[PDB]
Design a binder for this molecule. Structure first.
Ligand SMILES: Nc1ncnc2c1ncn2[C@@H]1O[C@H](COP(=O)(O)OP(=O)(O)O)[C@@H](O)[C@H]1O
Ligand SMILES: [Mg+2]
Length: 814
């Protein structure tokens, strides 16, 4: 069953309004009106603000093609609007003509919302009922006519490959569009163009209230409607007020950040930090006239770069013991912070009690707690505008959010916990005033508060766009740069040109910006295309487990930590783990395998090993989980046979250092440097940045006997000069195969091969032709795997694919 048809089953049904199903669903609506289950959920529904709007919203939808629906979080948009449309069609006898699709930002929301809406209809979710969901490679499909289907933006985008006009869908609901994810922004533009050819299509955009008229304006100033809600007053507290209220004092207990840990500072951030440090002395001074000396003493020493989870843990304990009843909701960045805080509470006997319910974001999150019991919900930033818990009275805003950024003049992109915007801070405050006067505790000081950005920039202006560029080409939307300029917030052309060029250097696009076979496969991997290249060749070459380890560390971070004052010995342990590999990436592999078998020897051995080698197990654990997700993507794309990164059949080459390094090269090219001849400092030539240095954290920073002239890297940083963060020595035959254009030059001395014209080394002419040939043979192998992809069988020795792949493997081991 071919890849372009996996989850197509709902879309490919034909919309035919059978007049007896029309009557059957009408007969069923009033039969439901007698089931106590249904009337009981109908009671909860009528107390939502959206219910009061019901027949005003359906009339707006019924009368216009494109509609924007505005409303505070919790008013009913996600769960009620699809129901309002189907029930209006059902009651009017037209119920079968109605095939509603509602898109969701995350796989989890598509499932949860479908199950909730189905519960509100006294039905099972899927299984031929009114409501269901479609995720990539997972389905609970509703009936074919008069149905609501919740899905992900990826599903729609894949659907467009099979039916660019989505002809069988009567209504499409774009939910949570204010989040401004890349895919949802591309979808909006594709749907706008589709309205011209689909006079019958209905399109409903659903947004939180801030900036919801921007979406109206983008759609030709289409009708807009706002579901009103009431918010009770919320007392806000800054870090000063919190520290004063609980007399916070930091506790009886420090590893290195920033440049040592691979963190570049963006210069647009540097301008506002200059305004912060310039205003800081006057702000402290005024604080000392209104807060206690100990409050200010503590405040001027708080770290701005990580949420103080110990402060949050203290504040929660103050709330539970000093404030009236009400659930508490915490907004943290990332699951690393959520589990740390959960364990901070759960280690204390006071919170092990039946009078507390502490939920990291779970069956019982919405259910109101008995008057004794206190609910504490620890959630990521995702619950700002998408999950609503009615019980909440106290909101703790950690003040931070995770967001990728892209540095266009140095082409380095990274992810970090940044300060929330004023808009986020106000949405978080609102969540506390939904049922009674609330309290919102903001974990930033007053000066920081005044210097927040008003809104977070859309992803389209911060992400790197390589993955998006592939999507545009796979949907045959035209010229990449031209199409992107039509988005509601077009990216900068510098970011577009960098992204296209990187894709060409990845060999995902050719010189005419057209997809290669490799690029097609990279489009089916929901990761950055350079990471997709690594993990794909980890599957083809059967070195999956160490490759996925390396891919995860590059995607997230390495597991090494550098406690302040222990630099000399931390680097001592790192290079011990290097083991003659001359590779920061293999070093993580060695540390990771040592960790897996340290934890198998007993968990006191695990704690010892992470401690003698300076590894954060919390980092290791998330790396492990990323490996399984990478595998699942390879499973869905047909390159691997099992969701397990340790499958023996995918790991026959997982101990061959040469092969592993060729795969690292596949993912990191064109980040290549030539090692300078030695006979002092270690420096290397780059294509354009000149002669640069090795980062002091790298296991190669003072390495004097390399065995090849070439290394690949992932991160270059600029402080006073340029530094390569993590580098790996590789053979010229790695670059020759996975690199750019190959050219031969000859004279009396020397047959040289040149790669991208500047990577130059001595090799016979025969190897250049042989590599050009194997590249073509690999293209055909990937091309033939485009329809119904299936993993390479390395147990069939006489396989043509095995013959070609074994030739490539033979070449890189040269
Ligand atoms: N899985 C669920 N179980 C119980 N209640 C839910 C569930 N999902 C949502 N709700 C409740 O339904 C109400 C409407 O939520 P929703 O329609 O998702 O809001 P929004 O307008 O922000 O999209 C909220 O008060 C929420 O608490
Ligand atoms: Mg919603």
């Amino acid at each position: 069953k071919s890849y372009i048809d996996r989850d197509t089953e709902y879309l490919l049904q034909e919309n035919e309004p059978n007049l007896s199903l029309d009557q059957h669903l009408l007969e069923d609506l009033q039969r439901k009106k007698t089931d106590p289950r249904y009337i009981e959920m109908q009671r909860f529904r009528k107390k939502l603000p959206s219910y009061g709007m019901q027949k005003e919203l359906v009339n707006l939808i019924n009368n216009h093609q494109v509609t924007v629906i505005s409303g505070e979080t919790g008013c009913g948009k996600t769960t009620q609007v699809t129901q309002f449309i189907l029930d209006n069609y059902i009651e009017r006898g037209k119920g079968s003509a109605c095939r509603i699709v509602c898109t969701q930002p995350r796989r989890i929301s598509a499932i949860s919302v479908a199950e909730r809406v189905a519960t509100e209809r006294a039905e099972s979710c899927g299984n031929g009922n009114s409501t269901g969901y479609q995720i990539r490679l997972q389905s609970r499909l509703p009936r074919k006519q008069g149905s609501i289907l919740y899905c992900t933006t990826g599903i729609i985008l894949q659907w467009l490959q099979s039916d660019s006009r989505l002809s069988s869908v009567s209504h499409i609901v774009l939910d949570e569009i204010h989040e401004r994810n890349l895919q949802s922004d591309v979808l909006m533009t594709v749907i706008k163009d589709l309205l011209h050819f689909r006079s019958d299509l209905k399109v409903i955009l659903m947004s939180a209230t801030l900036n919801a008229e921007k979406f109206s304006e983008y759609f030709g100033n289409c009708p807009m409607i706002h579901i009103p809600g009431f918010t009770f007053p919320v007392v806000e507290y800054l870090l000063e007020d919190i520290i004063e209220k609980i007399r916070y004092v930091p506790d009886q207990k420090q590893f290195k950040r920033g440049f040592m840990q691979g963190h570049v500072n963006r210069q647009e951030k540097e301008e506002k930090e200059a305004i912060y440090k310039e205003r800081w002395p006057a702000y402290i001074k005024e604080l000392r006239t209104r807060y206690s000396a100990s409050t200010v003493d503590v405040l001027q020493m708080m770290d701005d770069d990580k949420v103080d989870l110990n402060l949050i843990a203290a504040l929660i304990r103050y709330i539970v013991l000093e404030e009236e009843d009400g659930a508490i909701l915490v907004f943290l960045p990332g699951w690393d912070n959520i589990s740390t805080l959960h364990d901070l509470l759960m280690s204390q006997v006071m919170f092990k009690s039946d009078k507390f319910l502490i939920i990291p974001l779970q069956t019982q999150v919405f259910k109101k707690t008995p008057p004794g019991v206190r609910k504490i919900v620890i959630a990521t930033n995702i619950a700002e505008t998408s999950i609503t818990i009615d019980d909440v009275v106290y909101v703790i805003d950690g003040g931070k959010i995770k967001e990728t950024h892209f540095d266009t003049q140095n082409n380095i992109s990274t992810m970090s916990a940044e300060w929330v915007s004023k808009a986020n801070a106000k949405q978080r405050k609102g969540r506390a005033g939904r049922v009674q006067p609330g309290h919102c505790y903001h974990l930033y000081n007053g000066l920081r508060a005044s210097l927040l950005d008003d809104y977070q920039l859309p992803e389209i202006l911060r992400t790197p766009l390589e993955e998006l560029c592939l999507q545009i080409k796979i949907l045959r939307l035209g010229g990449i740069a031209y199409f992107l300029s039509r988005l509601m917030d077009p990216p900068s052309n510098e970011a577009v040109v960098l992204s296209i060029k990187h894709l060409m250097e990845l060999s995902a696009l050719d010189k005419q910006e057209e997809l290669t076979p490799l690029g097609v496969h990279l489009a089916r991997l929901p990761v950055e295309p350079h990471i997709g290249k690594m993990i794909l060749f980890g599957a083809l070459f059967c070195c999956l487990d160490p490759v996925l380890t390396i891919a995860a560390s590059l995607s997230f971070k390495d597991p090494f930590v550098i406690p302040l004052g222990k630099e000399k010995i931390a680097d001592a342990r790192r290079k011990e783990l290097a083991k003659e590999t001359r590779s920061d990436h293999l070093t993580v592999v060695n540390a990771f395998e040592g960790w897996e078998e340290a934890k198998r020897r007993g968990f006191r051995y695990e704690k010892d090993y992470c401690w003698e080698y300076f590894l954060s197990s919390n980092t290791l654990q998330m790396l492990h989980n990323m490996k399984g997700q990478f595998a699942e993507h390879l499973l869905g794309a047909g390159f691997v046979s099992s969701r397990s990164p340790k499958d023996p059949k995918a790991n026959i080459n997982s101990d061959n250092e040469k092969i592993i390094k060729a795969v690292i090269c596949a993912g990191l090219y064109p980040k290549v440097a030539k090692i300078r001849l030695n006979l002092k400092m270690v420096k290397v030539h780059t294509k354009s940045d000149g002669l640069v240095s090795i980062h002091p954290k790298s296991v190669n920073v003072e390495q004097t006997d390399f065995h090849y002239n070439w290394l690949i890297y992932h991160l270059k940083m600029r402080t006073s000069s340029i530094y390569l963060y993590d580098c790996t020595e590789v053979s010229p035959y790695c670059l020759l195969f996975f690199g750019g254009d190959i050219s031969i030059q000859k004279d009396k001395d020397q047959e040289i091969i040149a790669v991208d014209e500047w990577i130059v080394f001595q090799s016979p002419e025969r190897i250049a032709h042989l590599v050009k040939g194997l590249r073509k043979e690999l293209d055909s192998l990937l091309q033939e795997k485009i329809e119904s992809p299936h993993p390479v069988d390395w147990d069939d020795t006489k396989s043509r694919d095995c013959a070609v792949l074994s030739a490539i493997l033979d070449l890189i081991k040269t």
